């Protein structure tokens, strides 16, 4: 489990925009893995009327939020070989500026419910290669039935 | 070229947030096809304080927006053999409840200058298949270098 706390400093950036979905977050890490569960709901949207159904963007935006929670506590606890080095205060600072999708692959089954919904989190075979960390990541939502699912790389600009 | 005005009818639900981002687009049309370009803006995040760059999220939402616009006026023409039976009216009246999203893969380069870039974009081999509308699209960013890009089905469910 995830502190809220931690979690809260980690995702002020949304939160400060009404835009905080992740509700609790649990996680664990090897040297080179991480593997995150988190808990969401959306009140409405930031960006259009009101659709009654997920929304992709919203896909994309919850799986950011868990991600940069579930890096935060192996950051804060040295659990990622290639990220010691940072601090959690390290991390933190290259959030917004450094920390980058180079893609992404989606698919939505039976719409979610936005009220209350659940995804799955695992990133594998990072590596380094600008220098960045690759960070190729697998997630899938579900609540109702219903669910969705990516593929994502992400990269991380500075590190060690 | 699309007329502003049935470009600011079609992107209402965007611009009553302040998240109007295609300032001007033109389209081309057949039985079974769109192709439209389109010119964008990003003035800030809604969801997120700031990161001095695109954010996927923003091609996703750029994406939406030039679909959503370019097949108004093939359906305001009738130039969509399966969308006849539609007017404007309807096709406004579907916009948020039932076109959706089934799956989308994105790809990101040089990031973009958010602050003035342009897109293409072509669907093609439209199908009806709920009874659905499925329209795989592709698209294409860029600005400063720098360029994006997807591959994105949509499902319509109204129709015909
Ligand atoms: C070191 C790797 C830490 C990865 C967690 C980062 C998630 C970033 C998700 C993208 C966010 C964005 O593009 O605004
Ligand atoms: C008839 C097909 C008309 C397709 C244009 C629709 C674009 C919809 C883009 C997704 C929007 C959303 O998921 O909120």
């Given at each position: 489990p995830i502190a809220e706390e931690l979690l809260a400093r980690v995702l002020e950036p949304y939160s400060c925009k009404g835009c905080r979905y992740l509700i609790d977050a649990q996680y664990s890490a090897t040297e080179d893995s991480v593997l995150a569960y988190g808990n969401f709901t959306?009140?409405?949207?930031?960006?259009?009327?009101?659709?009654?159904?997920?929304?992709?963007?919203?896909?994309?935006?919850?799986?950011?939020?868990?991600?940069?929670?579930?890096?935060?506590?192996?950051?804060?606890?040295?659990?990622?070989?290639?990220?010691?080095?940072?601090s959690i205060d390290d991390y933190c600072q290259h959030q917004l500026s450094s920390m980058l999708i180079r893609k992404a692959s989606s698919r939505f089954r039976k719409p979610l419910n936005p009220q209350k919904f659940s995804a799955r989190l695992l990133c594998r075979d990072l590596q380094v290669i600008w220098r960045y960390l690759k960070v190729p990541c697998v997630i899938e939502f579900w609540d109702?039935?219903?669910?969705?699912?990516?593929?994502?790389?992400?990269?991380?600009?500075?590190?060690?």
């Open positions: 959306i009140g409405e949207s930031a960006y259009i009327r009101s659709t009654g159904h997920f929304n992709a963007v919203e896909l994309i935006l919850c799986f950011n939020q868990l991600a940069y929670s579930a890096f935060a506590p192996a950051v804060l606890n040295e659990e990622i070989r290639v990220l010691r080095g940072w109702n039935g219903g669910a969705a699912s990516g593929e994502i790389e992400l990269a991380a600009l500075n590190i060690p």
